[PDB]
Each structure stands twice: as C-alpha cells, then as structure tokens.
Design an enzyme around this catalytic site. Sequence first.
Site, PDB file in Angstrom:
ATOM      1  N   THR B   1       0.878  -1.196   0.000  1.00 29.09           N
ATOM      2  CA  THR B   1       0.000   0.000   0.000  1.00 29.09           C
ATOM      3  C   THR B   1       0.926   1.263   0.000  1.00 29.09           C
ATOM      4  OG1 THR B   1      -1.968  -0.775   1.076  1.00 29.09           O
ATOM      5  CG2 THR B   1      -1.437   1.459   1.487  1.00 29.09           C
ATOM      6  N   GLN B   2       0.898   2.128  -0.995  1.00 32.94           N
ATOM      7  CA  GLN B   2       1.735   3.331  -1.002  1.00 32.94           C
ATOM      8  C   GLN B   2       0.827   4.526  -1.146  1.00 32.94           C
ATOM      9  OE1 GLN B   2       4.210   2.938  -4.585  1.00 32.94           O
ATOM     10  NE2 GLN B   2       5.375   1.125  -3.683  1.00 32.94           N
ATOM     11  N   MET B 107       1.186  -5.469  -4.658  1.00 35.66           N
ATOM     12  CA  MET B 107       0.532  -4.571  -3.742  1.00 35.66           C
ATOM     13  C   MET B 107       1.565  -3.581  -3.217  1.00 35.66           C
ATOM     14  SD  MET B 107      -2.646  -5.235  -3.775  1.00 35.66           S
ATOM     15  CE  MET B 107      -3.409  -4.236  -2.395  1.00 35.66           C
ATOM     16  N   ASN B 108       2.328  -2.966  -4.142  1.00 38.30           N
ATOM     17  CA  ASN B 108       3.335  -1.939  -3.904  1.00 38.30           C
ATOM     18  C   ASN B 108       3.832  -1.502  -5.240  1.00 38.30           C
ATOM     19  OD1 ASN B 108       4.039  -3.949  -1.375  1.00 38.30           O
ATOM     20  ND2 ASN B 108       4.298  -1.752  -0.691  1.00 38.30           N
TER      21      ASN B 108
END
Lengths: 244, 232
Positions: B1-2, B107-108
């Site tokens: 998550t970013q 997921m990044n």
Amino acid sequence: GTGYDLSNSVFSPDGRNFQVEYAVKAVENGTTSIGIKCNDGVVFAVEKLITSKLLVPQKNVKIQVVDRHIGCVYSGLIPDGRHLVNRGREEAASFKKLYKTPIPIPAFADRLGQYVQAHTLYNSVRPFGVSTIFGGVDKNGAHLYMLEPSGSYWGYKGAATGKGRQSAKAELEKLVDHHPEGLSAREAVKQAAKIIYLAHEDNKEKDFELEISWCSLSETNGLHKFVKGDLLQEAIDFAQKEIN
Amino acid sequence: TQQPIVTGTSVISMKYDNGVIIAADNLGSYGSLLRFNGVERLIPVGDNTVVGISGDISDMQHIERLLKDLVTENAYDNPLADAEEALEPSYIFEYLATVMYQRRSKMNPLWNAIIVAGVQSNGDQFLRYVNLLGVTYSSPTLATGFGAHMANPLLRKVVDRESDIPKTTVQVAEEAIVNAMRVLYYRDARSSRNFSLAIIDKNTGLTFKKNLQVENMKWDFAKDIKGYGTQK
C-alpha cells in the site's frame, strides 16, 4: 604429474596448484589478443582467425562491452570467455543502479578477480580458462589491466596474451621504451594493428581478421565504440607497410 | 500500500505527419508546497524515443536508470545493435507495462502516469499510455493526469480521428501544444510556468527544447473585475 591435481585447491610441497597452471596452458592455445594503454585512452586489437571461407568475418568478435565504457577482449577458450564477461556485466549494471555513477576502472579489477578466486578456492568447481584484458576511460582517466585465470591482475602499459604473445610483447617493449607516455590514441590504433600482423607469423597457417575497438577521452567521448572505416583501412595499411 | 509523496503533474501529446510532440511542465510538488522546480520529466531513451513521466518523482528516477540500462542491455551480446537491430518505442512501452503490472499485483506499485512517444524504425508514429494500474491504449491525442480532462478536448479539435494525423503539420501541432500549456498553467494549481518540450521526428531526429515560457499571458481583464460578484 600425479598427485595434487585432480583438484585445483590442493597444494603440493612446492606450494603450487597444478590444475591452475594448466588453466594458463589453455589461454596460450587461444588467439593473439593485445591491449595498449595511452595517456587519454585505451586501444584493443585481436586476431580472430578465419577458419574457413564459409565463416562470416567481422561479425563474430572477441570484443565485448561492459557498461558502455569498458572494453574487453579475451584469450583462451571462447564460450568460457563469454561467461566471465557476463559476470562483469551484472556488476556493472548493479553498481550503476546503487550509486548512480559508473564503475571505476580500479573498482572493476578488484571485483572480477574475486569471482575467479571463489572458483580457485573450492576443490569441487573448475577455475576459469581465459584471460581478460580490459580497461577504458572513466572520471579518473584511462587505466588498463590484464587478469590472469590464476586470480591475479595488475596495471600495465601494454599487456598481451595468446600464442603470439612472445612477439607481441617484444613490439610492445619498443612502445614503452620509445614513448614513456604510452603513445597518443590515434597512432596507437595503427600500432595495435601492426603488432597483430607480426604476431600472426606464429598462426600463419590460417587466414586472420583484424577488428579494432577503442575508448578514448576526446575522440570516442569517454565511452567505448568500434573502430571502423577510413581509420580501420589506415591501421591495416600501416601494419602492412612495416611487416613488408 | 503506497501513498505518493512528491508528485509531478500532467503530460500532453499529439501526433503529426512526421512524428510526435511530447511536453510537460517541470515541477516536483509535495502537496501544498511546490518544493522542487526544474525537475525534468522527459527522459530521452535512445534518440528515436522520448519517454514522459508524471506522478511520483521517486519512481521516476527509478525508471530513469532502468531505461538507461535498457540501452546498455541492447549493446550487450551482439556486435552492433544501435542501428543494426535498432531500438524502438514498442520495447520500452511493453517493458514498462509488464513491470508496473507485476508491482501492482505485489501490492506496492510503481506510481506514475506514462506517455511513450517516439517514431519507429518503420517511422510510424507511436503514442500510447501506461500507468500503475496497467491500462494501455493508443490514441491520436493523449494527455495524463489533469491534462487528461482539461487540455485534451482542445487537442481533440486539431486531431479527432486517426485518419486525420496527416492533415496536421509540425507547426500546427506545436502551436496547439503551447495552447494546451497555456490552459494548464492557468487552471491547474500544480502546473508551473516552466516546461520542456521534445519534438521527435523521423527525418531530422531529436530536437529537445528546454526551459520555454508561456507567452501571451492574459490578465488585463482582471483590473475590470471587482468584488466577489457584487461590489457595494
């Protein structure tokens, strides 16, 4: 003889590893490869022998590039020679990512010589069977190394390997005596060619092909690039002129 | 998550008969604070393609080495390759697509909005969008970010459909690029006056103009305007 080879990491009462010395014996059998240090560049010249008229010349090189500024040329067994440059290529790439500056030429000598060394250290894997002359131009100027399959590297003004290495070093010997400065880049192209002519009097059976590459500060702009055309013709005319 | 930290805003582009024009404002914006100025968005990759990046400056630099390494790789394992098996936009574009999609699925993501604009070996104009999400589409006019919404409908007059590319000249396109920049300077608070503009051609090559300014900036109607709407 018998004993203390069969493995490359077993010493003898003379302190000497036999297998590894046969590694150097493999490099002799390969082709005449030379590199010349200049005070603004480096020039790489090679005898790529013509083994048939069905071969396609100047399209199979023993020149390879590392980063976009380090030239390489190999003596010995040809695909072993590929493999070690490949290693070079991963280090070049990795270093350039982390620090965001090219590989320094002294930095490169240290790193290569150590992979050669991890393979002379274990009894189980074979060593390399190739020497690699290399160098270029960086921010700290030109520098030239020749790395032995023994695990060793040194700076040189002129470095030679292969069969006709006895003749080529004799010519290089004139080049150091006569120019302490290592010679200008431009004249060293035509010189690099001459030495390979006089050193193919020991591989005279076959035909040969001269391919030249260089890296020079103000004439190849600190980067490696191939020598071609009028320049190439001249290196040929010059060599020719003086063998005759 | 970013979450993005410093971000670039907007890239505008369109096709012409002999190549493509790619342009974008030079700016590193940390939210309210316009922290960093003169932050080059357009990274030339070879000399037959310019790759434009807006979005996260963090992933911009990261891509900047990977593209330079894409050429260094092309040189590798071959005797010649810079005109023999010359580089193409098509390679970059898909390289970028695979990587950003893989990273989004871990997921990044890589947080950018990308415009690849160049001319091919065939010489045929190439103009395609790629992003963190993984979306890909080719269009006659493209724009990213805020320009997507705002400046692109202006560029859509000039060229509607893909059979209307040869009716635009280099002069027509560029004049419109300047007009799109004018709109963006005005009505985007995260645009800047400064902008760089690369024109890719197939018969001439790369001309890369740096640090152009918006001209004909209109504000003489502003003196006349008074109040919030009603002036007692």
